[PDB]
Every structure is written in C-alpha cells, then in structure tokens.
Amino acid sequence: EIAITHHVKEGHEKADPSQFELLKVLGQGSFGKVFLVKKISGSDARQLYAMKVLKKATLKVRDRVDILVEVNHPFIVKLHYAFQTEGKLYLILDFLRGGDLFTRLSKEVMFTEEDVKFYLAELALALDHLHSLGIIYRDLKPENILLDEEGHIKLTDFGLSKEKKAYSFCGTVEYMAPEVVNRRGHTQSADWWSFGVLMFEMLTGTLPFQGKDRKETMTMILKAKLGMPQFLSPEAQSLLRMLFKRNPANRLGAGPDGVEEIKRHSFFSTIDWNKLYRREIHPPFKP
Ligand SMILES: CC(=O)O[C@@H]1[C@@H](OC(C)=O)[C@@H](O)[C@H](Oc2c(-c3ccc(O)cc3)oc3cc(O)cc(O)c3c2=O)O[C@H]1C
C-alpha cells in the first residue's frame, strides 16, 4: 500500500472535493487516470491542477521547518492539496503534461558522467529550493524523480513510501544517511548524502550500501567502507567522497553556503547554473 507524505506550507488552506471544478479526464500513461481541475476559491482561485484519486492510499501530513506567496520552480512539481473522502485519497498536483518516471529512463539507458552532470544539476537546484521551503526528505530516492515532456527533472515535493505496526516515517534504507538511520537527529545535510546515493546509482547502476536485509544495510551505512568504482573520474570520486562523509558536519553541502559547496565542485565545473535554471540546457535524453 502507498503512503503519500504532504509537507504542508505554513498558512496552508485546507481543501475538499467541492473547491474544484472538473475540466477534463486524461490518460497519462504511467500516471494513469488524471483529472484536470480548476480551483474555485482561495489564494490560488482559478488555478488549473492535476487531480489523482487513489484507492487504498495512506496520507501523512508533516510540518515544514516575510509573508511570501509561492511561485513555480522549474524543476519541482508540488502537492498543493491532499485530502481523504469515502475511502479515497485525493491529490491536487501541478499539472504535468506527458510526464514520466525517472526510473523508466534509468532502466533503459547507461548514464555517462556527462549525462549525470545534467540530471544532478537540475536535482541540486530543486532539492536546495525545497530546503529553503523547509522540506527535509530523509529518504530522497528515484521514485521522487519525474521527467517532464521535455526531459527535464521534476522533483516531487511530497514523499512516497510503500507500507504489522505502523510507523510515522517509513524510509527506504538504502538512501538514508547514517544520522537518519541512527534516529538521533538530523538536518538538511542528510539529503545531500541521499543526493550522493542517487549520483552513485546513476553512474554505476548499483547502490553504494546494500546488504541482504535492512539490518545489514543499516550496519553498512554506519560502518561499511565504500569501495569506490575506479572507472569513475577523479572529480566524480571526489564529489562522492565528500557527500559520503559520515559526520554530517563534514559533509559537502552542510556548510553555511549549503548547495553552493556542491555547485562549486569540480564535477560541476561545466554547468552554467543560470542557463540551467532558465531551462536553456537540453537533456541528454528526450522522451
Ligand atoms: C506509487 C503511487 O501511488 O504513485 C502514483 C502513481 O501510480 C503509479 C503506479 O504510477 C500514479 O497514480 C500518479 O502518478 C503521478 C505522479 C508520480 C508517479 C510516480 C512517482 O514515483 C511519483 C509521482 O506524479 C505527478 C505529479 C504531478 O505534478 C501531476 C501528476 O498528475 C502526477 C501523477 O499522476 O500518482 C502517483 C501518486
């Protein structure tokens, strides 16, 4: 069973089925049946959204950590509303025409370092923006990563997990930083570890810390010395080593400059971050 985690923005305006006008019904391939709807009332009145109605899905609602009104970010899709009605979970999301799953692509292609620079660069901008909004992922993973019709990254701003006793947080262990596995407290720097795991997996098609079972994987995340694939460039190896520091205080991205520590790394030296943000760099793969 799926659990959706909604990180609600402060001053969130709770919703229900009656705040939405049905406009269209679409078949969106891997997304299944999607309703195009129009918000009737509130700050976002008249805004068009995608609506998903899930049978048997759990909703978890979490708080995030100047009175600003949010605007779109080029590499994020947002969950604006999530509410339960008669056994059904309604999700109101940014409309994503022709969207697809990153995992669909990753299964089909062999990424080079050049390819990964592009996807990780968009992902870094997205993740940092979520951090600024007060969202901490904990187990950022490929299921959180979509591609738009143009092949650009769309990071979901909501959590997705597969769920005898219920847990408030069900994380995919392979993507969790040591301090998260410890449950002894963590910050946004945990997500940069996960960013490193994503990078490692993109480059190698394997996970860096993987045991026979959750318990062993956890042991490995805490104590396992990572065998760095030698085919990787010095720059790739350097970035991975700096993201996989077990002490979060020493981890790249943990300093006051946060994501800039990553953006400044030699692995990303070819990236023009302003052109990237403007969506003026073409993806390695076009859907
Ligand atoms: C595991 C789960 O329940 O994910 C579901 C999707 O289900 C599956 C099997 O693809 C699909 O119903 C649908 O897919 C969408 C997704 C999505 C799909 C797979 C993921 O791993 C993550 C997200 O994201 C959207 C984002 C938007 O901005 C607008 C959408 O309509 C969808 C959108 O329709 O909604 C998801 C919440």
Side-chain angles (χ1 to χ4, degrees):
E1 179 172 3
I2 193 62
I4 298 303
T5 295
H6 183 192
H7 302 279
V8 286
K9 65 181 175 175
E10 184 188 349
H12 179 80
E13 307 164 12
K14 187 68 183 178
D16 66 50
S18 75
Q19 301 184 358
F20 304 91
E21 176 195 6
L22 178 61
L23 293 182
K24 300 291 299 184
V25 185
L26 314 164
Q28 291 199 10
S30 198
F31 291 175
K33 188 172 188 172
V34 174
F35 303 96
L36 179 74
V37 301
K38 170 191 284 287
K39 182 85 194 297
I40 296 171
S41 52
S43 300
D44 56 350
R46 293 183 183 181
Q47 177 63 228
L48 293 187
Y49 291 119
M51 166 187 283
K52 282 296 305 187
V53 189
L54 300 176
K55 303 186 309 174
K56 311 305 176 183
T58 284
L59 177 57
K60 302 179 177 191
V61 173
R62 304 286 174 253
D63 304 295
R64 294 170 185 194
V65 304
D66 280 327
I67 303 177
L68 305 171
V69 180
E70 294 188 0
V71 300
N72 306 330
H73 186 280
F75 306 124
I76 288 161
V77 291
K78 303 179 178 186
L79 180 60
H80 294 271
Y81 308 98
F83 49 85
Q84 292 269 28
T85 267
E86 170 53 22
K88 301 175 182 298
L89 177 58
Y90 286 67
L91 307 179
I92 306 297
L93 298 142
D94 286 333
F95 181 47
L96 186 59
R97 191 172 64 189
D100 213 336
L101 278 53
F102 186 79
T103 58
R104 176 172 185 171
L105 181 65
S106 69
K107 284 169 198 160
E108 291 166 356
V109 308
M110 185 82 71
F111 296 124
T112 56
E113 297 197 17
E114 183 177 332
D115 298 334
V116 170
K117 288 173 186 180
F118 170 85
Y119 293 108
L120 291 175
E122 295 197 336
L123 179 57
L125 288 183
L127 180 57
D128 170 72
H129 183 82
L130 294 188
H131 287 167
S132 290
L133 296 181
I135 296 175
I136 297 175
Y137 242 101
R138 299 196 204 192
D139 75 324
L140 173 66
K141 54 187 178 282
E143 287 63 31
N144 297 123
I145 311 179
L146 301 180
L147 297 164
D148 65 22
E149 60 184 358
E150 299 173 10
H152 292 271
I153 289 291
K154 293 293 194 182
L155 175 60
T156 65
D157 80 345
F158 53 95
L160 292 93
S161 56
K162 309 289 292 185
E163 54 160 61
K164 174 189 45 187
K165 294 271 234 165
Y167 291 83
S168 66
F169 174 68
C170 298
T172 299
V173 61
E174 284 87 0
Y175 297 92
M176 293 164 27
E179 72 269 19
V180 171
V181 169
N182 276 342
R183 294 184 178 184
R184 290 294 155 262
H186 57 85
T187 75
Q188 313 162 1
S189 60
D191 290 346
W192 294 116
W193 173 282
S194 308
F195 181 88
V197 176
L198 286 173
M199 170 178 178
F200 190 97
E201 182 183 14
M202 285 183 195
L203 290 164
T204 68
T206 70
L207 294 164
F209 307 98
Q210 180 80 78
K212 311 299 169 49
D213 47 30
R214 187 184 187 95
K215 287 185 176 61
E216 185 181 2
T217 295
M218 297 181 61
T219 298
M220 295 178 58
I221 291 168
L222 294 174
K223 291 167 53 180
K225 60 172 78 74
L226 176 63
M228 190 65 67
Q230 291 299 96
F231 71 85
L232 294 173
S233 74
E235 293 79 12
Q237 291 191 37
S238 176
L239 179 54
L240 285 163
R241 288 193 305 269
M242 295 165 179
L243 294 165
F244 287 150
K245 299 293 182 57
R246 290 195 159 90
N247 182 348
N250 300 340
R251 194 174 302 141
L252 196 68
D257 286 350
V259 72
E260 226 54 41
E261 301 190 333
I262 295 167
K263 290 167 67 186
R264 290 168 179 153
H265 192 281
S266 62
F267 185 75
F268 291 111
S269 69
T270 57
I271 299 297
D272 178 335
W273 297 92
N274 288 335
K275 287 193 70 69
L276 193 78
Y277 182 86
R278 291 194 302 265
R279 300 170 56 95
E280 292 172 356
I281 299 179
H282 282 86
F285 298 96
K286 189 171 207 154

